[PDB]
Amino acid sequence: DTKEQRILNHVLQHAEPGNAQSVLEAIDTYCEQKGDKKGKIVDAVIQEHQPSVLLELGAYCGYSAVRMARLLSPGARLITIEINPDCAAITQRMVDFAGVKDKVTLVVGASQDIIPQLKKKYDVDTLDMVFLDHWKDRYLPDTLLLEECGLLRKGTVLLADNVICPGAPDFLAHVRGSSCFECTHYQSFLEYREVVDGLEKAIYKGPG
Ligand SMILES: [Cl-]
Ligand SMILES: [Mg+2]
Ligand code: NA
Known part of the structure; x- marks a missing residue:
């Protein structure tokens, strides 16, 4: 969506190419300007369990893909399924720019169709x-x-x-x-x- 595109635009203009941490901080900054920290919880879980095969359902601007992929060990894999082609396009650009493309397999489509293909088609045994x-x-x-x-x-x-x-x-x-x-x-x-939220004003015009 327009918000995800503006996030990517911001990253490209301000983040250091190939630096995943720089990309994350730039996004946290863009969102900040416009209990525990969400990025901190994800990082903590991955560092606690060290997954070699990680499946991500949903990708909007590639924030989560980048955050998770940067922490993976060499040769470990992030598989990301995203149903909207436009969000997947942005996510790949973000992933490329962040320097983690070698760890990510982005798949466009519905999770309920792709999930039963993970073993046969993406050489998954079980997911970590x-x-x-x-x-x-x-x-x-x-x-x-x-x-x-x-x-x-x-x-x-x-x-x-x-x-x-x-x-x-x-x-x-x-x-x-x-x-x-x-x-x-x-x-x-x-x-x-x-x-993002909003209010609706609805003025009654009568039965008519
Ligand atoms: Cl995302
Ligand atoms: Mg979310
Ligand atoms: Na339970």
């Missing part, structure tokens, strides 16, 4: 980590799908963003109540890149 940041109504069905397709092993980490605002209540109820998942909640704050 999944970052969920796409359409909220996909969180629980894709989670059940990942399981059904044999992509989860004991120890696989699911990390879901925005589970409160806009919210993924059904996703939360499932994994929390299930003995198949061990759940931890991290309070956070919404950031500019993620959302």
Whole structure:
């Protein structure tokens, strides 16, 4: 969308080419200008679990791709599925510019179509980590799908963003109540890149 394009424009103008940290800071800056830090939580989870195969559902401007890819060990892989071609185009430009393109496989399409292809087509055995940041109504069905397709092993980490605002209540109820998942909640704050709000004025004109 227009916001993601302006984020990319800002990065290209101000971030140091090939420097992933420079790119992240430039985006945090663009969003700042216009509980715990969201980027800090993602970094902490990845550094805690050291995934060699990491699946990202949803990519808007490549912020999350870059943040996660920069921390991966050599030869480790980020696979990113994004349904909107325009967001995927921007994400790849961001990833190229940030210097991490060698770690990222960006795939355009719907998660429910691509997920069952991960083993056969993208040489995945099981996934070490999944970052969920796409359409909220996909969180629980894709989670059940990942399981059904044999992509989860004991120890696989699911990390879901925005589970409160806009919210993924059904996703939360499932994994929390299930003995198949061990759940931890991290309070956070919404950031500019993620959302935007507005008010509507509606003046009644009569029955007419
Ligand atoms: Cl993003
Ligand atoms: Mg988000
Ligand atoms: Na649980």
